[PDB]
């Protein structure tokens, strides 16, 4: 029953999911002056040329674009990672207004939205086994700011009318997630968690420094989605973000000087 409503939002999650008060929770504020440049970090390798998108789903919390993850098609490697991580889905978090929406913050700056590309470690065989391990997942986070349109986002925006409510899905083949990346792959990294219940502490976060630009119209169309199911009282799908959580005994590392 968790959500982002007036009585089931992030501040209530800990009652069903006590790990919400744990030691490695996400997101966090990235204090750029305390993050350490780590010259041992490698460039990120994002290999999406063979990615196979399948479907887009409104799950009641966000929409997920799902991929075929039964072979090494779309993988993330390098950076802080050991081994190979396969893309399973991406989704976004966004606000009701342009001044909030992101989950991670940068020196307390909130962006309008955040993209998460979720990948699982192939040495565990499946996503459900991977989430039980401290190196199971790698999530690439990309901030969105409102300005110029992102051409490679428009196919996502145009299908949202067809998945307005919880439990609706649409065929979403042939989408190229390379079109959602910024120019630079400089990043920050730290060990954390899923940002939705069950909030499992299985994620190596890789948060890009350079935001992508989207238009005001593109984000406006995200905000016309619904959290509810068909025929239920309309609840616009906005402010589906968890606020920043305590960093505790963790180090944020930067890939760049
Ligand atoms: Zn997310």
UniProtKB/Swiss-Prot annotation:
Effect noted on mutating residue 91 to C/D/E/N/Q: Strongly reduced CO(2) hydrase and p-nitrophenyl acetate esterase activities, impaired stability of zinc binding
Reactions catalysed: hydrogencarbonate + H(+) = CO2 + H2O; urea = cyanamide + H2O
Effect of residue 61 to W: Impaired activity, rescued by 4-methylimidazole (4-MI). Impaired activity, not rescued by 4-methylimidazole (4-MI)
Entry-linked SUPFAM superfamilies: Carbonic anhydrase
Residues annotated as domain Alpha-carbonic anhydrase: 1-256
Impact noted for substituting residue 15 to E: In Jogjakarta
Impact reported for residue 114 to Q: Strongly reduced activity and sulfonamide affinity
Site (Involved in the binding of some activators, including histamine and L-histidine): 89
Annotated effect of mutating residue 195 to D/E: Strongly reduced activity, but enhanced zinc affinity
Positions in coiled-coil regions: none
Modified residues (Phosphoserine): 162, 169
Keyword RNA-binding: no
Cofactor stoichiometry and binding remark: Zinc. Can also use cobalt(II) with lower efficiency, but not copper(II), nickel(II) and manganese(II).
Cofactor: Zn(2+); Co(2+)
Protein family membership: Belongs to the alpha-carbonic anhydrase family.
Associated disease: Osteopetrosis, autosomal recessive 3: A rare genetic disease characterized by abnormally dense bone, due to defective resorption of immature bone. Osteopetrosis occurs in two forms: a severe autosomal recessive form occurring in utero, infancy, or childhood, and a benign autosomal dominant form occurring in adolescence or adulthood. Recessive osteopetrosis commonly manifests in early infancy with macrocephaly, feeding difficulties, evolving blindness and deafness, bone marrow failure, severe anemia, and hepatosplenomegaly.
Task performed by this protein: Catalyzes the reversible hydration of carbon dioxide. Can also hydrate cyanamide to urea. Stimulates the chloride-bicarbonate exchange activity of SLC26A6. Essential for bone resorption and osteoclast differentiation. Involved in the regulation of fluid secretion into the anterior chamber of the eye. Contributes to intracellular pH regulation in the duodenal upper villous epithelium during proton-coupled peptide absorption.
The protein's name in its UniProt record: Carbonic anhydrase 2
Organism expressing this protein natively: Homo sapiens
Gene it is expressed from: CA2
